[PDB]
Design a protein around this nucleic acid. Structure first.
Ligand SMILES: Nc1nc2c(ncn2[C@@H]2O[C@H](COP(=O)(O)OP(=O)(O)NP(=O)(O)O)[C@@H](O)[C@H]2O)c(=O)[nH]1
Ligand code: MET
Ligand SMILES: [Mg+2]
Lengths: 595, 92
RNA sequence: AGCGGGGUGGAGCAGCCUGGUAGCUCGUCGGGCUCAUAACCCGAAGAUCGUCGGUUCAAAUCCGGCCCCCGCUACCA
C-alpha cells in the first residue's frame, strides 16, 4: 500500500503555475479569479488513469511500474505578500516543481522558494515555460518535447540552448548542478530541466513520467503506510463555511480516518480536543478551493487524501498545526505532548491602538498583516469573520482619540445590514475588497485626501504677515479722513483687505477698507507693487504720519500654524517679515521674545 | 525644590475662579483652567502670582490641568539665580 | 491742510478775567476705635503750574515761539 506523493508547485508571479494545473485537470480556473493572481492554496488529486492516458510509449524506457495510485498536487501563490503560504507548501510536500520563465530569468521569489526548499530538504525538478515566445516556433496540441523539437529550425534550437545554458549557469552559482532530462544520466546529485508549454501542452508527458519515476528512487520507504493505524495529518487552512461553522481542510497521510474519531489539533494557546462530526470529500479532478461540483459526504477516508473536517470548537485552530487521532485518554495525552513540540511560525503583533481588519481565512489575514506592517501601520485586532456590529463600535472607540486609525478593511467578506446602518449613522468608513493591493491603496489615498483636506481649510483662517512704509511724498495722500486714502509700497509680506494694521506702540489705526492700484478695484498686492489704500479709523498726523512704517497685526496661533503646519508655502520675504515682526512685538508677551 | 518630571511644567497663577479652580499661565504660552486636587487644597493656601507645577489632563491637554506643588520664596529665588527660569515669565 | 479749545501732586476739578497764600474730593503710607475687617477720627508725604523768552518792584495769572492732546470743516484712489 503506497500513498499518493504530495507535489508543491512554486514560482514567480505570471509564470504559469495555475495554468499547468488547469491543463492537467482540463478545466479553467485561471480566468475565474480577480486580478489574475491566486491567493488561496489548494490540494488536487489526479487519478493514475488519466496519467497513463496522457503518457504513452515513453513509460517503457524506465524499468519500473506505474503502480502509483495517483498524484496530489498543491498550488501556491507567487506574490510577495504570501510568504507563509509558500513556506507551508514547501515544508509539507514531498516533491516540488519550480516553474521559472526563461525570458525573465530569475526573481527574488524564485530565490526565496529555493531557500525554503533547501531548508526543508525537498528534492525538486525545474520546469521552463513560455516556449512559444521564441520566434519561429510551431504549436501542436499535447505533444512531447521530443516530438516537437524535430519540427523547429536551427535558430529556435540554438536560442533555446543558449537560454537553458544561461539558466544552468545561474543554478551553478546557486551551488546546484543542472542538466537536461534527456541529456543527463545521473539521478542523485543532478536535477532535470523540462521545457514545457502550459498553453499548448508541450512536454507535459515528460514531466509527468519523470515525477512518477523519481518518487521511488530517492526515498520510497517513506511512502509505505499502515492501513489500520491511527490517522495523522496536518492543517492546510481555516475558513468559515455556510451551514457547517468553522471547518478545517486537512491532508491525511498516515493511518485511516473514520467518523466520530477523537482528534487532537494544536490551537493558538493550547491543544484542543473534539469529536469529528462531518467528513467532506472533493470530487475527483477538481480544485478543492473551487467547488465546481458538489462535495460528497463520506463516512471514512484513507491516507492520503485532502478532506474537510467539520467539528465543534475549531475557531481557535492554528494553520499548519498537525492533527493526530487519539481514541483513548493516554493517546490524548501523548498527542498533547507531541503538539507541545510545535512552533508558531507567524505571530501577529497588535499595538492595541490601531485599525480593525477582517478576512475570510487565516492566510489572507497573515498576508494583509504583513503588508500593513511593511508600511508602519499599527493593528488593533485581526480575526476571521464577517464585519459585525461590535467591530464598528470598537472602530468608533479607537476613532474617538485617533481620527486616522478608526477604519475597517474587509478582504473578501460581507457587511451585515445592522453594521452598515450603524456605520452610516455614526460616519465610520469601511473599505471592502477582494485584492490586497487594490484594497490597501484605497485606504492610503483616502488617508492622504483627509490629510490634505485638514490643511485645505486651515489656510483661509490664518492671515499673512506684512510690513509697509508710507511714502514721504505729499502727492500720494488723496483724502485725509473718512476714508484715509494714501499710496503705499510693500516692504515685505502680502497685503489683504480686512486686515488690521498696528504701529510699534500698537495703536489701532483701523481696518483696511479697500485697496486700489488704479481706478480699477484690486484684491491683493504682492512684493514690489504700489497701491493706494483707503482705510478707516486712520487720520494723518495724530494717528499716522508720512514716512512712518506700518506693521500688520499678527495672531500667535496664526504664527504657530505658519511656522509648523504651513511651512511649505513660506519664502524669503515672508520669513523675513514674520521674523522682524516677532522681534518688534517682543515687548509685552515673552512668547514673541522666544519666537 | 522638586522639579517637573514628564509633561509637567511651571506656571503662574492669574485669577481664582472659585470652587477650587484657578487660571494658570504656563511656560508654553497657554492659559489653562486648572483644577486643584483636594488633598493639598485643605492645607496649602494659594494666591494669585505664584510659581507652581501643573500637569495637563490626559484628554484635551490644552486648557485643563492639575496643580501639584507650590514654590516658596526661597525656592523661586534659588531657581531665578540658577537660571532654569527667567524673571519676565514670573513678572509677565 | 485750515480754524477753534486746552496742558496744575497718583486721579478728576478750583485758583484767570481783578498779578502779591498754589485749595477741593478720591488715592498711598503711619497711628487711633472693634474679638477681627469694612465704615469713621487724627497726623504727615506728595505739584513750584508742559517747556523757552519777553513785561513787571514782583508772573501759573499779561504777551509771544515751540511740544503734546481734543473738537469742527474742506478733502474719491
Ligand atoms: N504565450 C503564453 N502565455 C502563457 C503561457 N502560459 C501561461 N500564459 C499566460 O500568462 C499568464 C500566466 O498567469 P498564471 O496562469 O497566473 O501564472 P501562475 O503560474 O498561476 N502565477 P500566479 O497565480 O501567482 O500569477 C496568463 O495570462 C496565461 O494565459 C504560455 O506558455 N505561453
Ligand atoms: C491715485 O491717484 C494714485 N496715483 C495714487 C498712488 S498709487 C500707489
Ligand atoms: Mg496561481
Amino acid at each position: 500500500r503506497i500513498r499518493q506523493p504530495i507535489i508543491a508547485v512554486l514560482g514567480h508571479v505570471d509564470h504559469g503555475k495555475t495554468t499547468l494545473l488547469d491543463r492537467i485537470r482540463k478545466t479553467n480556473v485561471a480566468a475565474k479569479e480577480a486580478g489574475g493572481i491566486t491567493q488561496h492554496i489548494g490540494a488536487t488529486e489526479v487519478p493514475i488513469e488519466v496519467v497513463k492516458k496522457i503518457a504513452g510509449p515513453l513509460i517503457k524506457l524506465w524499468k519500473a511500474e506505474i503502480k502509483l495510485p495517483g498524484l496530489l498536487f498543491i498550488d501556491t501563490p507567487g506574490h510577495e505578500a504570501f510568504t507563509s503560504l509558500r513556506a507551508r507548501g514547501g515544508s509539507l510536500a514531498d516533491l516540488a516543481v519550480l516553474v521559472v520563465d526563461i525570458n525573465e530569468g530569475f526573481q527574488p521569489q524564485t530565490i526565496e522558494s529555493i531557500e525554503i526548499l533547501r531548508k526543508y530538504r525537498t528534492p525538486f525538478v525545474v520546469a521552463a515555460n513560455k516556449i512559444d515566445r521564441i520566434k519561429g516556433w510551431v504549436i501542436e496540441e499535447d505533444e512531447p518535447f521530443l516530438m516537437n523539437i524535430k519540427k523547429q529550425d536551427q535558430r529556435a534550437v540554438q536560442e533555446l540552448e543558449t537560454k537553458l545554458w544561461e539558466l544552468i549557469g545561474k543554478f551553478y552559482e546557486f551551488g546546484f548542478q543542472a542538466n537536461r532530462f534527456d541529456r543527463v544520466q545521473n539521478f542523485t546529485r543532478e536535477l532535470a530541466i523540462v521545457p514545457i508549454s502550459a498553453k499548448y501542452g508541450i512536454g507535459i508527458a515528460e514531466l509527468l513520467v519523470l515525477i512518477a519515476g523519481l518518487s521511488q528512487r530517492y526515498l520510497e520507504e517513506k511512502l509505505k503506510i499502515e492501513v489500520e493505524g491511527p490517522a495523522r495529518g496536518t492543517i492546510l487552512e481555516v475558513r468559515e463555511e455556510p451551514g457547517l461553522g468553522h471547518t478545517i481542510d486537512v491532508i491525511i497521510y498516515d493511518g485511516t480516518l473514520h467518523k466520530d474519531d477523537t482528534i487532537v489539533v494544536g490551537g493558538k494557546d493550547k491543544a484542543i480536543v473534539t469529536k469529528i462530526r462531518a467528513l467532506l470529500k472533493p470530487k475527483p479532478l477538481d480544485e478543492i478551493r473551487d467547488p465546481r461540483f458538489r462535495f460528497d459526504y463520506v463516512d471514512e477516508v484513507t491516507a492520503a487524501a485532502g478532506v474537510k473536517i467539520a467539528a465543534p470548537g475549531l475557531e481557535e485552530a492554528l494553520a499548519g498545526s498537525p492533527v493526530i487521532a487519539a481514541p483513548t485518554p493516554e493517546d490524548v495525552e501523548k498527542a498533547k505532548q507531541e503538539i507541545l513540540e510545535q512552533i508558531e511560525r507567524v505571530v501577529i503583533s497588535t499595538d492595541k491602538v490601531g485599525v480593525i481588519v477582517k478576512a475570510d481565512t487565516l492566510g489572507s489575514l497573515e498576508a494583509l498583516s504583513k503588508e500593513l506592517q511593511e508600511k508602519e501601520i499599527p493593528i488593533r485586532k485581526a480575526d476571521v469573520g464577517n464585519v459585525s456590529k461590535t467591530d464598528v463600535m470598537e472602530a468608533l472607540s479607537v476613532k474617538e482619540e485617533e481620527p486616522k486609525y478608526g477604519v475597517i478593511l474587509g478582504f473578501n467578506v460581507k457587511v451585515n445590514e445592522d453594521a452598515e446602518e450603524v456605520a452610516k449613522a455614526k460616519d465610520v468608513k469601511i473599505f471592502v475588497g477582494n485584492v490586497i493591493y487594490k484594497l490597501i491603496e484605497d485606504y492610503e489615498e483616502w488617508v492622504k485626501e483627509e490629510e490634505e483636506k485638514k490643511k485645505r481649510e486651515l489656510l483661509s483662517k490664518v492671515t499673512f504677515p506684512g510690513v509697509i512704509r508710507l511714502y514721504p511724498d505729499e502727492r500720494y495722500v488723496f483724502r485725509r479722513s473718512n476714508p484715509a486714502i494714501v499710496g503705499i509700497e510693500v516692504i515685505e509680506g502680502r497685503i489683504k483687505p480686512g486686515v488690521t494694521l498696528i504701529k510699534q506702540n500698537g495703536q489701532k489705526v483701523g481696518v483696511i477698507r479697500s485697496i486700489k492700484s488704479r481706478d480699477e478695484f484690486l484684491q491683493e498686492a504682492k512684493k514690489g507693487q504700489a497701491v493706494a489704500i483707503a482705510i478707516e479709523g486712520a487720520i494723518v498726523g495724530r494717528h499716522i504720519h508720512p514716512g512712518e512704517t506700518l506693521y500688520v497685526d499678527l495672531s500667535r496661533d496664526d504664527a504657530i500654524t505658519l511656522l509648523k503646519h504651513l511651512r511649505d508655502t513660506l519664502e524669503d520675504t515672508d520669513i523675513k517679515a514674520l521674523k522682524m515682526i516677532a522681534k518688534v512685538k517682543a515687548k509685552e508677551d515673552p512668547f514673541w521674545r522666544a519666537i | 525644590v522638586p522639579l517637573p518630571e514628564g509633561n509637567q511644567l511651571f506656571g503662574v497663577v492669574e485669577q481664582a475662579l472659585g470652587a477650587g479652580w484657578m487660571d494658570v499661565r504656563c511656560e508654553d504660552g497657554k492659559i489653562r483652567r486648572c483644577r486643584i486636587p483636594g488633598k493639598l487644597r485643605r492645607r496649602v493656601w494659594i494666591r494669585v502670582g505664584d510659581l507652581v507645577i501643573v500637569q495637563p489632563w490626559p484628554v484635551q491637554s490644552d486648557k485643563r490641568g492639575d496643580i501639584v506643588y507650590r514654590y516658596t520664596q526661597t525656592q523661586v529665588d534659588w531657581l531665578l539665580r540658577k537660571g532654569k527660569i527667567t524673571q519676565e515669565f514670573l513678572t509677565g
